[PDB]
């Protein structure tokens, strides 16, 4: 609705000093011809200069020299706030000096060769930060701000004095790129970024607006996350977007200096941050300054931790200063800092999922010059355990092997052709596959949080189980009003039991997928690790994480692992009590339903699970997953072969008909054996025909007809010739007895 | 400020601490506050160095030089008592201690009031309901919750106003208010900073929450109520109070629901400890913590210290046969020691509970200890009526359903089973309501009837149908063999 809130679009006058008009808009403005109009955009950098060299284009979209997009803006679709501010002072003059592309060739004076013919009767109505193109030649070189005799911008005049003693730069350009980093650059963490924005942007932009209510803003934020996730870029991008100041503190850099000099820098940091407008302080590798005091032994260490604490306690809320710190884990710093008034809010970064890795590949892949076969999606999905720095390494590896293996006899010779052939250079899928061959991910041990994609199309039947699940997880998160009306206490668990590998792990994920909620899976080996290692404190981390990421279906399978470890039902002299079970019970008893975190369990031998966990306030529910009946195996098969070709001579319904009861993994084994037979037959036929072509000197005999690009009935018939009923009837009867009489 | 003192140089640290007391002595009756004493005088086993002890010594000597003629008093803040050098916890030094604790439902209400003064609330804001459902919070979490709700209101309401710079912002802040949904959302994303600490407060459960047990009530009132009112009778007849009682019977028949009751009738605090803590101190082999509980029980008196699942450790090493050993362990020994080293004149009571009494060490039933055994039996006629009325008092109910009929149909049941029946009925009601609502919504959607008003909940309450469906799947959670075994345990108390 703001009248001067209008889009900006393409421009044709290669000189940036021109700014457009829109006569219907000029009638709205007081836009006068002369020196300058203040056209305001983002990050406070503007493109202020002479005006009215436009009205060639349509209205509602101001024509602004494209070079004022990289500056003052980012892309199209933006909006300008054009408001005149002509008649600026006439100081001495504005800086003259190039930046990047002038040392390449004759330099002379850098003013009187190429740039002099442009400050003619248009004597630079400018604003420091306006960047453009000006030359007396190839017509592509920048003109940047270096000096400032008058603080505000002016209109130059002859007879002045200029010193091109300055040198064109390039490292300065990299620094400018750091300033340039913005929301689109950082990728792979969307949900996390939204919280930081809603936390820091609103207090910053309008301080008095948030102060009027007077509620407390946050003083410090602590970011978790393994290395390489990208945390410096987040802080720099936030600072760039809020147009505020910044200050960086490196822990190792602080610790290197002398004992006496260590505190001076840390005091100066806060002092400088206090002398400016709303600013943000960043500390990287906090563990190097304030680790757990049990490890540290000395005098300087505590004498610096105390300084950090006292400085953090002297803000007073009237300075509009906020601090963010980077640390690997929460249980890695002195708990003194994790207190109110000190660091009190925490945000975890995590590990990018399949969606985020696609964004990271995109931001990195800009100069790749890819081919059609490059399927970035397939590349991203098969990238388990990588982080924001491993992907860059993978891209570099693929690119450099392309360079070498292709120009194995070109790049070795010195000649400009190298650059030329770089234009001819490209990248193929095989390069990416090969590079993925030698990729050692830096994180394959960390607990995984994400939304599994498994849908019930992946498992056919279990209708009543579907209904019960939707009752237990779906309905509560939609209509709490019904619980309020009838005063109801949600149930917080459910227990499974039945034969082995009948899809239990394939159901929990399913509900999460229908709930769009994350999921976490923990198996028996971890239970054995914390048993033998006798470290059950880890059980507090899992739950803690489950609390941060909610909702989650925390799934425990092979619950009977520890029970069977000390024998079966008879077991040892003891009963059915252990340590990890006690910690599980404690955490369950100390959890609030109002965070919507669900717990699921699984086991094959339910007779050897402690009954101490089936009382109210706990699972208190038992569900039995039976052997698949008719046409459930049909859906299982369709899921199995949906990634492999199949002919029509084979009918999955026939395979289902032949079997009279089977487990879940056995059908997968049958399909895999059929695939193995197909692969062997194809390879053998191909090699035999290749040998025929070799021994026979038929220099030209073209024949490309794969005898088996698919699968036939024969493969499945041979598979049927060797198969198992993996479960005996005695187990079925035992489960029937376990059903008891449910009166 | 402790950290402020520690930051300075070694030489400069003592000058400030001397100047503090010097200035305090130059004025009229004054008070000195030390925050985070742990930063200056921690347990010396942790500290290794020279400056640390050279400052603890200065603190002690300064503390010993008051002379009582200056009218100067000092208070210090510390997280726990076993966190400072015991030198300071001596006579002439710090000798009096006061525990702040964790605010209960009543206190959190006051904190909400003091914080909520510019909130500009609406009618629906029920601060009471907000306060009661605030377990585990402290004096700083409530401020954070207030801020979260306020700012969420600011954003979600002025999502297209506050983003534009204009004085109207302040003006719309006048139009700004807060709704209950904002508080509920804030409570959704609230992580309390204290959910593991022992709780001390007066439970509100009354005997209206459990109907029968007349003789049990009389004996309770004899054991806990009467002594705290007429010690003169004990003096006259020269009587020694009994300091314990033991329970035994089937599972979950209200044992936990009785101890609190007596506390409620006595307006005295209560503390509950369960088997998982016993297993934690067994496996962890840290029974010293057993001295903390009692210590706290001494500070907050009277208290009915309740131990349930006492047979947990007994069953852990098997049942009656168990292991080669008998019925002796470590935590039981510490319990016996602390009971033997306690004075009745502080009025602290101890209660126990268990389901399998045959596997509890008889070493604790001798005089000077519980020495009393009580059996809570299966509820008889109309006790289940009271338990039902307690169960559904937070839910609407129609008149077609008669709780007396439900009691009549059953011929003996546990305590939690009736709760399960009520919960299943509530689940059926919720499912039926949701299904009917969604079906009618789909009818309204598929039919382009732009205006068809009908607000008649088919079930804003519960009907019998739900209860007969519940009856169609119910369990007697306890078998008759257990009843006979308890009968044998009754033995012949000639």
Residue numbers in the entry:
A (entry chain A): 21 to 763
B (entry chain F): 270 to 763
Question: What do the study authors state?
Answer:
In eukaryotes p97, also known as valosin-containing protein (VCP), or Cdc48 in S. Cerevisiae, is one of the most conserved and abundant AAA (ATPases associated with a variety of cellular activities) family member. In fact, p97/Cdc48 acts as an unfoldase that couples the extraction of proteins from membranes and complexes to ATP hydrolysis. p97/Cdc48 is classified as type II AAA ATPase, as each protomer contains two consecutive ATPase modules and assembles to a homohexamer with a two stacked rings architecture. The NTDs are essential for the recruitment of most cofactors, as well as for substrate binding, whereas the ATPase domains regulate ATP binding and hydrolysis, controlling cofactors binding and substrate processing.
We generated three mutants of the human p97: F266A (D1), F539A (D2) and the double mutant F266A F539A (D1 & D2). To structurally study the effects of the D1/D2 mutations on p97 we used single particle cryo-EM on both the single (F266A, D1) and the double (F266A F539A, D1-D2) mutated proteins and obtained 3D reconstitutions at 2.7 Å and 3.4 Å, respectively. Overall, in both structures the D1 ring highly resembles the conformation of wild type p97 bound to ATPγS. The D2 rings aligned with the ADP conformation. (E) The D2 ring pore loop 1 (P545-N558) of p97 F266A and p97 F266A F539A double mutant also resemble the ADP state, as evident from the pore dimension and the interactions between neighboring subunits constituting the pore. The strong structural similarity of these mutants is in line with the similar effect they had on the growth rates, pQC capacity and UN binding affinity. Three conclusions may be deduced from these findings: (1) The D1 (F266A) mutation is dominant over the D2 (F539) mutation and thus imposes on the double mutant the same conformation as was determined for the F266A mutant. This conclusion is in line with the very minor phenotype both the F266A mutation and the double mutation (F266A F539A) had on the functionality of these mutants in cells, as well as the lack of significant effect when substituting the wild type CDC48 in yeast. (2) In accordance with the all-“up” conformation of the NTDs, the affinity toward UN of these mutants (F266A and F266A F539A) in the absence of ATP resembled that of the wild type p97 in the presence of ATPγS. The deduced Gibbs free energy of p97 F266A F539A upon UN binding (ΔΔG2−14−3=−388±350calmol), represents the coupling energy between the two phenylalanine side chains and is in line with coordination during the structural transition associated with UN binding, indicative of cooperativity between the D1 and the D2 rings.
